[PDB]
Amino acid sequence: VNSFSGYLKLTDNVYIKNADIVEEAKKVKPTVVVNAANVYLKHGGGVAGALNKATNNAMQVESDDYIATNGPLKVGGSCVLSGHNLAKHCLHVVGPNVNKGEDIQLLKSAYENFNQHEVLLAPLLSAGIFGADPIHSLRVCVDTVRTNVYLAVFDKNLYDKLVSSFL
Ligand SMILES: Nc1cc(NC(=O)NC2CC2)ccc1C(=O)N[C@@H]1c2cccc(O)c2C[C@@H]1C(=O)O
Q1: Starting from the edge strand earliest in sequence, which strands make up the sheet with 8-9, in order?
Q2: What would you report as the CA-atom Rg of the chain, rounded to the nearest whole angstrom?
Q3: CA of 46 to the centre of ligand 1 (A)
Q4: HSE value, Cβ hemisphere, 13 Å, CA-based, for 28
Q5: Rounded CA gap, 103 and 58, in Å?
Q6: 154 C-alpha to center of ligand 1: Å?
Q7: Phi/psi class of residue 47: alpha, beta or left (left: φ > 0; alpha: ψ in -120 to 50)?
Q8: Which of 50, 112, 126, 161 has a CB 3.0–4.6 Å from the CB of 130, allowing a cystine?
């Protein structure tokens, strides 16, 4: 038993809810919140800019030190950093950005990072300003992640379409 509330159960291990992932993180304080990161950990917009804003830019300060030491991530890759005031840890995961021409097959590799954590609060990878089809992203999530994932979908219209179209 965990503290996530109001989710619809899609499979044995995947749950979904129309929710603002920022508000959901502040309320649950999960062990892991997933960020929709880019390879430079430049948290400008979408899910990343919102999570970073909620940390009063501390996420960006930590991220800049990470990149100065380690260099950029790979598309499909991840790193674990602090969750600041939102979670114990933030798993920064880089899904492919269709608006940069990146290979959508990298979406499965991106979701594989979630399997290193028993429970996660997450957005749909590559959705939103990353340009992929969120229905496809949800399908890859369900077919790739084996650990317990609580997906937060900001847009109510999309959530209903995601729910109403799910096989
Ligand atoms: N830019 C944001 C900002 C926040 N939250 C705040 O700003 N919270 C502050 C405290 C009030 C949450 C989500 C977002 C955000 O980009 N969503 C995206 C989106 C939108 C429409 C269609 C989509 O496919 C997607 C994929 C993303 C998602 O929903 O995962």
Answers
A1: 8-9, 14-18, 148-153, 119-122, 32-36, 89-93, 78-82
A2: 15
A3: 5
A4: 24
A5: 31
A6: 5
A7: alpha
A8: 126
Run of H or E including 122: strand 119-122
Centroid of ligand 1 to alpha carbon of 74 (angstroms): 23
Q: Check if the beta carbon of residue 38 is closer than 8 Å to that of residue 48.
A: yes
Mutating to test ligand 1, I would choose from 27, 47, 159 the residue with most ligand atoms within 8 A of its C-beta, which is 47
- Domain 14-150, architecture per CATH: 3-Layer(aba) Sandwich (3.40)
Domain ranges of the chain: 14-150
Residue 103 token pair? 């290979």
Q: Smallest Cα–Cα separation from 36: which of 28, 27, 26, 45?
A: 45
Query: Which tokens in the block code for residue 105?
Result: 């097959």
Are 8 and 15 in contact, with CB atoms under 8 Å apart?
yes
Give the resolution in Å.
1.0
What was the structure determination method?
X-ray
CB atoms within 10 A of CB 157: 9
Residue 65: count other Cβ atoms within 10 Å of its Cβ.
12
Short-list 49, 47, 17, 43, CA closest to 34: 47
Residue 135 identity = I
